[PDB]
Structure formats: C-alpha cells, structure tokens
Amino acid sequence: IQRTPKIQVYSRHPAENGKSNFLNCYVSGFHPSDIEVDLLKNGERIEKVEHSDLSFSKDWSFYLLYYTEFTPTEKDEYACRVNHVTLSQPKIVKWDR
Amino acid sequence: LSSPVTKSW
Amino acid sequence: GSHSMRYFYTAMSRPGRGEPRFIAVGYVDDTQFVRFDSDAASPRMAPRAPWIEQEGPEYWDGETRNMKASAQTYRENLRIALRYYNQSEAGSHIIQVMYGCDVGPDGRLLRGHDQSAYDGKDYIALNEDLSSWTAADTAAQITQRKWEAARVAEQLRAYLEGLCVEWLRRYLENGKETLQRADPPKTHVTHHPISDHEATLRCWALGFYPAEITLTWQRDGEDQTQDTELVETRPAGDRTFQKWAAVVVPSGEEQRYTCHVQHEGLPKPLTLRWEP
C-alpha cells in the first residue's frame, strides 16, 4: 500500500569548485505523493528551492526533482533531507561528487 | 491536446 | 524515429483539508510541455515548454475548461471509489491516470493507452484493441460495466486515433529542434580502490536525451547483470539525463572489464574501459 522514496543527490554539471552549478535531489519510486524535501547547506535549509510538477512512472510510483543554484567549494557540505509517511525519521543523503 | 472524454467510475 | 504523447493525472483526496487536489501534466516523449494544478492561485493549463507557447487563447481556454471538468469528474470518482471499496471518508486516497498515443516515423498510430490506478494499484485499463477493458478487481468491474453501457471505449478510440495523433504530429513539427533531436551521452569510466585487492569501476553517461539508455558491464565479454549496481536514470534539469553503472573488480583485473553504452543518439553502441 506504501512505497518508500529512492533518493539521489547530484549536480547538473560535473562539479568544479568556484563555478556555478545546480544541486539536485531526485526522489522517486514513492507512494503516496506527499513528501517533504529540503536541500541542506552545512546542515541548514536552503531557501527558495524549486521543484518539478508531480508526475509518476509506469508502476504508478511518484517522482520529483528538487533543485537550486549553488557554487560548490571544498569546505561546504551539501545534502538532501527527505521525509515521507514510510519514514520514521527524516532520511539524510549527503552530496558526493 | 488532452482527452475530452468523460470517465465517470 | 518513434514518438509518444502522454498525459498524467493525479487526484488526491485530503479529508479535513478541502477538496481533492487535481494535478495534470502532459509530455511529448521525455519533455513536459503543459501542467494544470487545482491548487494554483488561478488554475489554468499552462505552458512548460517553449514550443507550446505559440498556441493561441482558444487552445489554452479550451484546455483549461477540459482540466476543470476533469478535476470535478475525478473528485467524484474518489467519492465513488470510497463506496466501491467500503472505505471510510476519513482516509486520504489517490486516483492516477495515464493515457496517450505512440506513433512511428511516418506519424501513424502505433498504439494507444488509457490506464487508471487506485491507491497505487492497477484499477482499469483500455486494452490494446481500444475497444475492450481489463478490470483488476470487482469494483473496477462495476466501472467496466458502466463504460461498456456508455461505449466509452469508442470515444477513447476516436480520441486516440484522431486528435491525439494529429496534435502529437503538430507538436513534433513545432518543436522539431528539440523533440526530434537526440543528444548522445558523454561517457567515461572512473576507478576507486576500496581495499588493497578490490576497486570500483563506474561507467558514467551524462547529458543524453531521450532518457532511454542501456549501460552494461562485461567481464571477459560476459554480462555482469547480477553483479552490476545500476542507478535509476535521473534528470539533470536541463532536459537531459544521467545514469551510471558500477562493478566491484579484483585489483589487477580492471582491463578484463568493458562498459557498453547503447543510446538513440549514437550511430553505434560504445565500448569503453578504464584508462589510467
């Protein structure tokens, strides 16, 4: 009756420190459709994150792309924080280049 | 163009 | 060569929080071009691709009317579904619909689709003949008897063979710069030791369109399906897609592994290996 989201955190282009880019969190394979997704910069929630229109795959499971502009550095740590009815506590996935 | 067909369950 | 148009409806009830949300999106292949959201400040069918913006006020008004009618119909359908499954009015439920047409290179109908789900499970589907139905359970059988009595399949067939294909052709022409352009993957192999005698080889494909792709690892020319970690194809956000495939190999055996890449934008399948 319920399916937990798969989560990928990644950049739009290959990361180069000091160069502008897009940070993406793609959540997929979940059901039902209510989901909470935050992009984190050093543990803190990035504001004005945008996301795609709700759609679903051939197996009826939903997917969403959350994204924001960012400029990666060597020190800064980025992550995606996802909550869903299937999750007892928020799952956090760290961005790994 | 979307379907104009009504589908009442 | 071949193309598809697909509309996706999500109708979600939410007891205590107003009327069910209705969200519709339209796609040509892997390119979204319209959206409707009943939760918007002013709900309307709205452009999501540059080549659809040229359509005039009659198009957008007609589509908006159709979407509001559809939203009403599917709110009612959620109410009906409650009765069909002996369910209470306290829970949240979801109806999903996906429908559309596939055409070949010459623009002729390859086949039509109209499939619906309730709470994530198959509910009822139009068969490939576009004249009969497959119901998943006894409730859906009720719906089926209704649609047979009303010859709904005939109307759907008329839409899929007529308007669906015609407008798909039109969209393919207006957006030919993008909808009829395949972007091949940019590919490479990375190598990361995990221990003194094992290493990960990861085969990357980036910036490709459409999303359909095949990435496989072979060891000594044999497919390593069972041993390959394959991530789900993911959108980059610029219309293109990304995917990788990883295999854990014994140190010193890296050259026995080859990555094979198949994509529409490639004249021939690619073979690549780790290049230290």
Numbering used by the authors:
A (entry chain B): 1 to 97
B (entry chain C): 1 to 9
C (entry chain A): 1 to 276
Passage from the reporting paper:
The human leucocyte antigen (HLA) molecules, encoded by the major histocompatibility complex (MHC) region of the genome, are cell surface glycoproteins responsible for the presentation of both endogenous and exogenously derived peptide antigens for immune surveillance. HLA-B*57:01, HLA-B*57:03 and HLA-B*58:01 are micropolymorphic HLA allotypes of the HLA-B17 serotype. Polymorphism within these allotypes is focussed on regions of the antigen-binding cleft (cleft polymorphisms in comparison to HLA-B*57:01: Asp114Asn and Ser116Tyr in HLA-B*57:03, and Met45Thr, Ala46Glu, Val97Arg and Val103Leu in HLA-B*58:01). Notably, residues 97, 114 and 116 contribute to the E pocket of the antigen-binding cleft, whilst residue 116 also contributes to the F pocket.
As a consequence of these substitutions the C, D, E and F pockets of HLA-B*57:01 were the deepest and most negatively charged of the three allomorphs. The depth and negative charge of the D and E pockets of HLA-B*57:01 accommodated the Arg and Lys residues at the PΩ-2 position of LTVQVARVW and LSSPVTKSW with the guanidino-head group of the Arg bound deeply within the E pocket, interacting with Asp114. For all allotypes mutation of the P7Lys to Gln had marginal impact on the Tm (<1 °C), although the P9Phe to Trp mutation showed a trend towards stabilising all complexes (+1.8–2.5 °C). Overall, these structures showed that the buried polymorphisms generated minimal differences to the surface of the HLA molecule available to TCRs whilst engendering marked differences in the peptide surface landscape available for T-cell interaction.
